[PDB]
Amino acid sequence: QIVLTQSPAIMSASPGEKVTMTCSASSSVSYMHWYQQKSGTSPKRWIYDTSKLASGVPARFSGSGSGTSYSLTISSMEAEDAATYFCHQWRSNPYTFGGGTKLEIKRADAAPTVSIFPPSSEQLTSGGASVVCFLNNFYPKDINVKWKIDGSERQNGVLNSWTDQDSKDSTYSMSSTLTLTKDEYERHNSYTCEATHKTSTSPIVKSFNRN
Amino acid sequence: EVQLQQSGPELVKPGSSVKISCKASRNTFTDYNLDWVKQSHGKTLEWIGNVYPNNGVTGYNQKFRGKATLTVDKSSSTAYMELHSLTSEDSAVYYCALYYYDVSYWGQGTLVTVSSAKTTPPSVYPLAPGSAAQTSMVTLGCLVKGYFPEPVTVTWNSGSLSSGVHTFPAVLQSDLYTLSSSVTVPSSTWPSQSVTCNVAHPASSTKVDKKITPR
Numbered sequence: 001q002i003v004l005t006q007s008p009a010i011m012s013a014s015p016g017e018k019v020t021m022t023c024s025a026s027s028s029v030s031y032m033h034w035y036q037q038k039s040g041t042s043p044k045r046w047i048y049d050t051s052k053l054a055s056g057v058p059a060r061f062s063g064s065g066s067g068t069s070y071s072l073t074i075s076s077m078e079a080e081d082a083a084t085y086f087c088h089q090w091r092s093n094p095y096t097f098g099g100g101t102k103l104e105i106k107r108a109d110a111a112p113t114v115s116i117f118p119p120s121s122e123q124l125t126s127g128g129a130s131v132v133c134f135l136n137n138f139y140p141k142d143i144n145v146k147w148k149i150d151g152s153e154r155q156n157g158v159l160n161s162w163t164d165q166d167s168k169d170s171t172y173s174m175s176s177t178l179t180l181t182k183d184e185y186e187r188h189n190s191y192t193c194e195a196t197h198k199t200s201t202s203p204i205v206k207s208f209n210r211n
Numbered sequence: 212e213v214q215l216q217q218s219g220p221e222l223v224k225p226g227s228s229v230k231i232s233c234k235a236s237r238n239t240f241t242d243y244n245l246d247w248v249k250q251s252h253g254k255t256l257e258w259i260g261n262v263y264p265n266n267g268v269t270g271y272n273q274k275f276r277g278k279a280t281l282t283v284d285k286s287s288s289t290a291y292m293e294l295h296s297l298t299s300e301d302s303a304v305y306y307c308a309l310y311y312y313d314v315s316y317w318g319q320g321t322l323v324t325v326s327s328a329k330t331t332p333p334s335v336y337p338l339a340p341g342s343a344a345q346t347s348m349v350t351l352g353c354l355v356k357g358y359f360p361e362p363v364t365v366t367w368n369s370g371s372l373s374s375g376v377h378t379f380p381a382v383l384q385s386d387l388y389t390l391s392s393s394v395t396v397p398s399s400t401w402p403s404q405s406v407t408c409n410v411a412h413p414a415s416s417t418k419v420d421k422k423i424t425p426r
């Protein structure tokens with residue numbers, strides 16, 4: 001099979017600047033196809049036959065190359081272009097795909113909006129107690145969350161989840177969930193989520209008293 | 212102009228088989244093909260094979276020999292892929308994609324989960340603020356806990372709230388998934404107006420609504 005190797009695997013691009021990504025084939029091919037996959041969507045053919053734009057694709061996208069070396073270029077990076085791009089060849093049986101280039105865009109630093117939520121009365125009756133902390137709409141993506149119960153750090157029992165870069169405002173969000181037993185929840189009073197992020201020298205603290 | 216509707220997500224026992232379908236909406240295409248593609252772990256794509264419903268041969272990828280069988284129903288032109296002797300390695304999203312010269316249309320994907328675990332619907336809990344906070348905006352949430360298999364889909368006010376929504380990827384812990392969703396709205400719109408999270412879990416045929424009420 002013809003193996004496709006893409007570069008770079010991931011990249012952060014300045015808004016309005018040219019972006020180039022490449023696809024190298026193990027053998028020559030006549031044409032290369034490119035696909036865009038945005039968060040939570042199916043892949044969509046984006047450029048076909050090396051240089052032809054799919055329906056609806058804007059003019060800032062182009063494709064070039066020949067033989068074993070192909071490129072996809074964006075003349076001016078826009079927020080909506082944040083996505084993963086895959087190359088795809090139809091010469092060999094079987095057809096193959098490259099591993100993808102994940103493209104993100106730069107923007108101004110933004111502090112997370114932090115919200116903490118006590119367990120719902122509904123959950124507590126089941127014998128579980130989840131305290132949920134959302135850290136929303138921050139940039140850059142690097143962030144750390146620390147839990148404290150009565151001033152003491154709790155590391156175990158935490159579920160974290162992170163969104164991909166938003167297509168509209170180019171930020172990131174995170175959810176952190178600390179799940180205790182109901183009985184252990186009722187033994188302590190103070191619950192706190194602390195966000196460490198480059199936008200502040202001190203962490204953003206949200207807390208509540210079980211009351 | 213054409214849309215592909217794939218069959219729904221599947222939970223399959225190890226060793227069993229499953230047949231998934233892909234039907235294109237009304238068209239007059241002649242020499243079109245339908246390709247099947249596996250996406251593992253939300254990342255790498257593999258071409259499984261293809262068919263030419265208006266009679267052409269079938270393309271196969273030898274990596275999937277004895278694993279995938281592709282057919283087409285002549286009557287409806289519905290395309291089918293049967294996956295055989297399933298293992299956890301076969302858990303993935305499977306896409307169908309229609310190609311006709313300079314146009315292409317992909318289905319929405321079918322998530323196949325191979326597991327001996329049974330279906331468990333989520334417990335859906337409303338997340339309202341605690342003692343207080345007070346800004347121009349207020350953030351509310353919904354915790355969707357302890358379900359299996361994926362997927363679930365979350366909406367807020369049946370789609371009328373969207374721009375302020377963040378629904379987070381599910382995480383698997385001890386054989387059950389949990390996810391959360393947050394929505395941020397002006398403080399003047401809640402609690403004065405209703406905010407409700409809508410959580411659908413196709414595997415249990417459930418569509419659960421939870422109104423967020425002040426504590």
Ligand SMILES: [Ca+2]
Nearest residue numbers: 238239240288
């Ligand atoms: Ca037909």
